[PDB]
């Protein structure tokens, strides 16, 4: 599924992402925007280390979900990577929450630093009713 901007904003709020581990909803919106363009079906193979990024938040198979084919990987979210390709994002959200529980927080995703940190991210949630 390809979400519309405000539709996702509203969904994430409901799933309790606003301010989770100190991260504002606008930050989560900015991340999803640059990672997958709000697409739950998005996958990206990293030829470099043989891992794959899955779903709306482009969660990596080396540490967060099990895809079986990633060498020396762990599954901290306790999910099949398949779970992160569903239209319903409840598993993806639960996993994203698990990722920011580590010291790095939101910095765990390099693209957050490149595209969202120290920016005016208000744009991602303006007029959504969140």
Curated annotation (Swiss-Prot):
GO terms for cellular component: azurophil granule lumen; extracellular exosome; extracellular region; extracellular space; specific granule lumen; tertiary granule lumen. Monomer. GO terms for molecular function: identical protein binding; lysozyme activity. Disulfide bonds join 6-128, 30-116, 65-81, 77-95. Its EC number is 3.2.1.17. Lysozymes have primarily a bacteriolytic function; those in tissues and body fluids are associated with the monocyte-macrophage system and enhance the activity of immunoagents. Pfam families: Lys (PF00062). Keywords: Amyloid, Amyloidosis, Antimicrobial, Bacteriolytic enzyme, Disease variant, Disulfide bond, Glycosidase, Hydrolase, Secreted, Signal. It is found in: Secreted. It comes from Homo sapiens (Human). Residues 1-130 form the C-type lysozyme domain. InterPro entries: Glyco_hydro_22, Glyco_hydro_22_CS, Glyco_hydro_22_lys, Lysozyme-like_dom_sf. It is linked to Amyloidosis, hereditary systemic 5: A form of hereditary systemic amyloidosis, a disorder characterized by amyloid deposition in multiple tissues resulting in a wide clinical spectrum. AMYLD5 primarily affects the viscera, and the predominant clinical features are renal dysfunction of varying severity, and intra-abdominal bleeding. Inheritance is autosomal dominant. This is Lysozyme C. The active site is at residues 35, 53. Belongs to the glycosyl hydrolase 22 family. It comes from the Eukaryota. Lysozyme C is capable of both hydrolysis and transglycosylation; it also shows a slight esterase activity. It acts rapidly on both peptide-substituted and unsubstituted peptidoglycan, and slowly on chitin oligosaccharides. Its main location: secreted. It catalyses: Hydrolysis of (1->4)-beta-linkages between N-acetylmuramic acid and N-acetyl-D-glucosamine residues in a peptidoglycan and between N-acetyl-D-glucosamine residues in chitodextrins. One of its GO terms (biological process) is defense response to bacterium.
